Structure 1
Amino acid sequence: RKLRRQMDIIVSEVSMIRDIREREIRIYTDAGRICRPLLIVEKQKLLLKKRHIDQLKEREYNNYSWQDLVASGVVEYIDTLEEETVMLAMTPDDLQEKEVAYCSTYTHCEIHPSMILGVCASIIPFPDHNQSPRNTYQSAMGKQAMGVYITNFHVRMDTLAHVLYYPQKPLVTTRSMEYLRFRELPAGINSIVAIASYTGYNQEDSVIMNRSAVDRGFFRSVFYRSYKEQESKKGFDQEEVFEKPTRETCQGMRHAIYDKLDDDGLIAPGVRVSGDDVIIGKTVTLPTKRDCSTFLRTSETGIVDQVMVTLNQEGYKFCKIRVRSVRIPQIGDKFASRHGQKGTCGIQYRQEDMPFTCEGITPDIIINPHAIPSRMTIGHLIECLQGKVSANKGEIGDATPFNDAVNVQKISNLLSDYGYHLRGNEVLYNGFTGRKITSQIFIGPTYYQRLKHMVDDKIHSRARGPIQILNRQPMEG
């Protein structure tokens, strides 16, 4: 252990396991062993001192870093095998306290208990306040949400890419988000969510959206679809080439207009396209020349964003056409609350139709109250509460799990100083009649995510369409 902590002859990833009851000492130096760093504890005291923290604060222009902690023997990597022999204190503030005396031989301490979470799970606020299946479901929703997938999304020509117009950093963040770069590349918008049974259109996990907010760009996004095509001379009898088919060039052509294509057979950027339009004009010589143009789908409606021409790995003429389609939130689009409450937009009500507070604030999204009791997503309620204080206090709330400094009572106390009901409730007025609602509605800023599942991407219809000539049965046209 001493040599490992000093890194003299044993590297930090080597694990030494002694089976005291079995007179066995196993030293594992092989690859693929999962391990994690744990602070070393000696004589019920942490080896980490303020001097190390000060040197870690002065990280810049000083070159002091994590490697200096390992070399100092303050922290070491413990693997799943060695953990059996390790007596791990959850926190130095209470687990190694002589007053508790639960164990007097702690060997290590957790740096922060929240580091057991993954990437998607670290995006959940107050996960310790949510039911475990909802944290699992959010981990999937976080991967299906919309935001900015990468900074160079304008240069990249990915086959499918959804970029949110106005992504925002969450008003209630988890400390891990600073390391996940969720602040620089957010995937959602802080929405004023009201939990109310407003005319029943939000029933059964449905959501009601403010049409005036959507008109202002709320959750608006741009969908980029990249189409790739190349011309290959494989087989001397066939020679495909990009060029717009012409009556004299091709023996047979449809009445569809090819005027969108340029003399090079490629559509130009800034041109509107639909299932009736051709993005690439390709023709192959027959063993006259037939046309093998690339048409868009009937659902594809957008504008040509960029068209590149290059020579691919095969050396053949290759081109990629990126079509831009703007997806405005509409009935049926799926949304997620960052706490596993996934739901489709049921209806959109304008600002005058939505219920309003005494200050004239109308919720951006209204969710059904029955979604919370069965799911027990109290972390959502606490996030909605912490977000209301955050927006008023002008500070990004910290929702890191297992943190004793933040609790519902402290959040309620702060909210009381901003002139709001300590539990987040507000007296809402019905937008249709102006009468106060008898029950006070829980409303506040909650981080919502738009999922890639748009209704326009799934709606389809079939009525006497193309059939297979051999099987005489339905097939996609």
Structure 2
Amino acid sequence: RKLRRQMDIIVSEVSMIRDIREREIRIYTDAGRICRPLLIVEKQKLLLKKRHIDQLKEREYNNYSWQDLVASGVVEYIDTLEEETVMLAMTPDDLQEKEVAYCSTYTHCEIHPSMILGVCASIIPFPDHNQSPRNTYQSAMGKQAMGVYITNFHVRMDTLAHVLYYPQKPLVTTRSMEYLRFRELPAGINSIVAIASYTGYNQEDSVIMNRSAVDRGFFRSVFYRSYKEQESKKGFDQEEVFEKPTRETCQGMRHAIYDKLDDDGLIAPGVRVSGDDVIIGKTVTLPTKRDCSTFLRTSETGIVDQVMVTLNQEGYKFCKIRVRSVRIPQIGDKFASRHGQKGTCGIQYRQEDMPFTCEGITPDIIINPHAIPSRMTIGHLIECLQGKVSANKGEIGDATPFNDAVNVQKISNLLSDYGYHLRGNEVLYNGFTGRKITSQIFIGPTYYQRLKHMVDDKIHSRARGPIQILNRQPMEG
């Protein structure tokens, strides 16, 4: 252990296991072992001292980093079967000091207990207040949240690129989000969410969204679709040519328009293209001509964003065309918070119809209160309260899972200092009649994500269309 700590002969990756009762000592140097760093505890004191933290605050232009911390014998990499013989503590300031005797032979201490979570699960604010199924659901849905997936998307030409108009970093954030680079590439917009029953259109899991906010760019996004075409020479006199076919030069012809194409059969960007419009004009010389042009997907109604032409591996002409279409959130789109609270948009009400506070605040999203009890997302309510506190305070809330220094009572006392009800409730006036709603509605900013699942891509209708060649039955898909 001393050699591994000093990294003289044994690298920190190698693990040492002492099975005391079975008298075996096993040392593993093979690849594939899973391991995590852990602080070393000597007697009841950490080996992390104040000087290490002081140097790490100075990490910039000091040439002192995590590697030097490992080389000081302070942290240690421990695998699963070396974790067998170790005794860990949650936090030093709780489990190392003397108390009613439980244990005193602590050999290691965890850096922070929130490190047990993965990438997608670390974005959940207050994940310890949630039912574990809801945490799993949010971890699954976070991959589907729309946003700026990459900064150089303008140069990438890939199918199904979803980019959100105005991503926002969450009001209530976790300290792990900094290391996920989530601040620079957020997926979702903080939204004033009032958990209330308003018109019954948010019932079950559905939500009610502010139409006026939607008109202002709220949860508006772009859908980029890319089309690739390959020129090729397969037959002797058979070849692929990029060109604009005329009315009668080819044998096969579809009633779709071809006038939008340029001289090479490629539409320049800035051309609005609807369903059945031709993207690339390509013909086949049959051993007169055969038209194999590429058309739009049905009812996309987008605008050609970027057109790129190059040479493939073989040296033939290769064309990629990216078509963009702006999709305003409809009442079929799928929206989910950071707690597994998912649902579609029941209906969109304008600012006039939505309920309003004494200050004129109208919720951007209304979710049915019936979701919370059975689905067990208390962290959703706590995040809403913390966001309401932080928007007034001007700071960004800290929702690290295991803080012990952020109580719901403390957040309530913080909120009560800003002239609001300490529990987050707020009196709402009916949008239609103007009468006070007898119950006081729990309203506050909550981080919500627009999911890739949208109604325009899912709606389908069939009436005597194409049939399979073999079964003579309707096609699949």
Same fold (TM over 0.5): yes
Deviations 1:257-308 (A, max 9, x none): 2001001011111011112310110000001111111111222210000000
Deviations 1:110-140 (A, max 9, x none): 0000000000000000000000000000001
Return 248-257 or 401-410, whichever deviates more: 248-257
Alpha-carbon spacing, 1:375–1:251, altered in 2? closer, same or farther (3 Å): closer
Alpha-carbon spacing, 1:238–1:441, altered in 2? closer, same or farther (3 Å): same
Q: Does structure 2 conserve the Cα–Cα contact (< 8 Å) formed by 1:465 and 1:476? A: no
Return 461-470 or 234-243, whichever deviates more: 461-470
Deviations 1:131-160 (A, max 9, x none): 000000000110001000000011101111
**In structure 1, how many angstroms separate the alpha carbons of the residues matched to 2:473 and 2:251?**
30
**Alignment gaps of 5+ in structure 1:** none
TM-score (norm 2): 0.99
Deviations 1:377-426 (A, max 9, x none): 00000000000001000000000001011110110000000000000000
**In structure 2, how many angstroms separate the alpha carbons of the residues matched to 1:140 and 1:89?**
30
The equivalent of 2:41 in structure 1 is 41
Q: Does structure 2 conserve the Cα–Cα contact (< 8 Å) formed by 1:145 and 1:450? A: yes
> How many angstroms does 1:256 deviate by?
2.6
* CA-based RMSD: 1.1
**In structure 2, how many angstroms separate the alpha carbons of the residues matched to 1:252 and 1:97?**
84
Return 462-471 or 159-168, whichever deviates more: 462-471
Q: How many residues align?
A: 477
**In structure 2, how many angstroms separate the alpha carbons of the residues matched to 1:474 and 1:218?**
40
Q: Does structure 2 conserve the Cα–Cα contact (< 8 Å) formed by 1:17 and 1:82? A: yes
Q: Does structure 1 conserve the Cα–Cα contact (< 8 Å) formed by 2:240 and 2:282? A: yes
Q: Does structure 2 conserve the Cα–Cα contact (< 8 Å) formed by 1:39 and 1:75? A: yes
> How many angstroms does 1:240 deviate by?
1.1
Deviations 1:342-399 (A, max 9, x none): 1000100000000000000000000000000001100000000000001000000000
Deviations 1:191-241 (A, max 9, x none): 000000111000010000000000000000000000111111022242111
Return 217-226 or 467-476, whichever deviates more: 467-476
**In structure 2, how many angstroms separate the alpha carbons of the residues matched to 1:170 and 1:384?**
11
> How many angstroms does 1:470 deviate by?
4.5
> How many angstroms does 1:247 deviate by?
2.8
Q: Does structure 1 conserve the Cα–Cα contact (< 8 Å) formed by 2:251 and 2:291? A: no
The equivalent of 2:383 in structure 1 is 383
Q: Does structure 2 conserve the Cα–Cα contact (< 8 Å) formed by 1:145 and 1:452? A: yes
Alignment identity in percent? 100
**In structure 2, how many angstroms separate the alpha carbons of the residues matched to 1:257 and 1:333?**
31
**In structure 1, how many angstroms separate the alpha carbons of the residues matched to 2:434 and 2:300?**
42
**In structure 2, how many angstroms separate the alpha carbons of the residues matched to 1:188 and 1:256?**
38
> How many angstroms does 1:337 deviate by?
0.8
> How many angstroms does 1:190 deviate by?
0.3
Q: Does structure 1 conserve the Cα–Cα contact (< 8 Å) formed by 2:214 and 2:328? A: yes
> How many angstroms does 1:22 deviate by?
1.0
**Alignment gaps of 5+ in structure 2:** none
> How many angstroms does 1:248 deviate by?
4.3
> How many angstroms does 1:45 deviate by?
0.2
Alpha-carbon spacing, 1:248–1:200, altered in 2? closer, same or farther (3 Å): closer
> How many angstroms does 1:43 deviate by?
1.1
Q: Does structure 2 conserve the Cα–Cα contact (< 8 Å) formed by 1:238 and 1:287? A: yes
**In structure 1, how many angstroms separate the alpha carbons of the residues matched to 2:250 and 2:394?**
67
Return 379-388 or 297-306, whichever deviates more: 297-306
**In structure 1, how many angstroms separate the alpha carbons of the residues matched to 2:83 and 2:221?**
47
**In structure 1, how many angstroms separate the alpha carbons of the residues matched to 2:470 and 2:237?**
27
Instruction: Give 3-state SS (helix, strand or coil) of 2:248's partner.
Output: coil
Structure 1 stretches (4+) deviating beyond 6 angstroms? none
> How many angstroms does 1:467 deviate by?
2.1
**In structure 2, how many angstroms separate the alpha carbons of the residues matched to 1:8 and 1:456?**
62
Q: Does structure 1 conserve the Cα–Cα contact (< 8 Å) formed by 2:310 and 2:317? A: yes
Q: Does structure 2 conserve the Cα–Cα contact (< 8 Å) formed by 1:230 and 1:318? A: yes
Q: Does structure 2 conserve the Cα–Cα contact (< 8 Å) formed by 1:284 and 1:291? A: yes
> How many angstroms does 1:313 deviate by?
2.1
Q: Does structure 2 conserve the Cα–Cα contact (< 8 Å) formed by 1:211 and 1:350? A: yes
> How many angstroms does 1:469 deviate by?
4.8
The equivalent of 1:299 in structure 2 is 299
The equivalent of 1:120 in structure 2 is 120
Return 126-135 or 256-265, whichever deviates more: 256-265
